Amino acid sequence: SQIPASEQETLVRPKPLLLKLLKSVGAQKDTYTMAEVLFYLGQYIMTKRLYDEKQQHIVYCSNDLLGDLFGVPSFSVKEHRKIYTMIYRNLVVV
Amino acid sequence: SQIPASEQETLVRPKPLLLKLLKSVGAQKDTYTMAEVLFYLGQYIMTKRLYDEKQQHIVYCSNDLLGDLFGVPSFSVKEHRKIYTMIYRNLVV
Ligand SMILES: O=C1c2cccc(Cl)c2[C@](OCC2(CO)CC2)(c2ccc(Cl)cc2)N1Cc1ccc([N+](=O)[O-])cc1
Numbered sequence: 001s002q003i004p005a006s007e008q009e010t011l012v013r014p015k016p017l018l019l020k021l022l023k024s025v026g027a028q029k030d031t032y033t034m035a036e037v038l039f040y041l042g043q044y045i046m047t048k049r050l051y052d053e054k055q056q057h058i059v060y061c062s063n064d065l066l067g068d069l070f071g072v073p074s075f076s077v078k079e080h081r082k083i084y085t086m087i088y089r090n091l092v093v094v
Numbered sequence: 095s096q097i098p099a100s101e102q103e104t105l106v107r108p109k110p111l112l113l114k115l116l117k118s119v120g121a122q123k124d125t126y127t128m129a130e131v132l133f134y135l136g137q138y139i140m141t142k143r144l145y146d147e148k149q150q151h152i153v154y155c156s157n158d159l160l161g162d163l164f165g166v167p168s169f170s171v172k173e174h175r176k177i178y179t180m181i182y183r184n185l186v187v
């Protein structure tokens with residue numbers, strides 16, 4: 001956060017639409033700190049799949065020589081076994 | 095270490111197209127450890143921008159109530175002051 005601590009702990013009362021949204025994912029109250037609002041928005045965001053975590057770590061290799069060699073348009077940098085399998089089809093163990 | 099150390103250190107010879115890919119970003123040899131192949135693949139990937147921060151960190155809220163509350167189709171989770179500004183419009187302190 002580039003937001004000062006004092007600001008994060010500011011006590012606030014969500015308007016009716018923001019309140020309904022927060023309670024829709026389990027918020028219990030009518031007043032919150034700003035830190036609490038952000039926690040519940042985070043839950044809302046993840047629940048409505050407005051952010052995708054897997055898609056944060058993707059190589060897009062279609063129409064590139066790498067896509068030709070691996071035989072795929074995309075892959076996760078976090079899935080090492082899957083990369084190794086694709087690499088092995090392009091070499092010989094000595 | 096998803097991959098065992100000994101496998102990472104396995105000595106391998108890239109077939110011609112992979113080899114040309116590797117030398118295209120500075121690789122100097124015909125023979126490599128698997129670790130070395132992954133390093134040079136990484137350099138290729140980043141050079142050609144096949145992986146790019148431009149697609150990262152985004153909340154796409156255009157088609158959700160949140161987009162209507164925030165007045166935008168999307169926002170970056172890293173833009174903390176923007177997020178605060180957008181939230182303050184939706185409340186009273
Ligand atoms: O770092 C992240 C993060 C990363 C990826 C996806 C999501 Cl969803 C989040 C998000 O919540 C994550 C969770 C915690 O509550 C688990 C749910 C979030 C993003 C955007 C919003 Cl508007 C709210 C939370 N978050 C927390 C946060 C972001 C920004 C600020 N700020 O403005 O100073 C404060 C807190």
Ligand SMILES: O=C1c2cccc(Cl)c2[C@](OCC2(CO)CC2)(c2ccc(Cl)cc2)N1Cc1ccc([N+](=O)[O-])cc1
Pocket residue numbers: 059077079080081083084097132133134135136137139140145
């Ligand atoms: O963690 C990351 C990472 C994160 C974001 C983008 C990129 Cl490009 C990479 C990548 O290279 C990073 C750099 C180092 O050489 C600086 C360039 C990479 C991804 C995919 C491939 Cl196919 C190769 C490297 N990498 C390293 C790595 C990933 C997977 C394995 N594994 O399967 O055992 C081994 C090593």
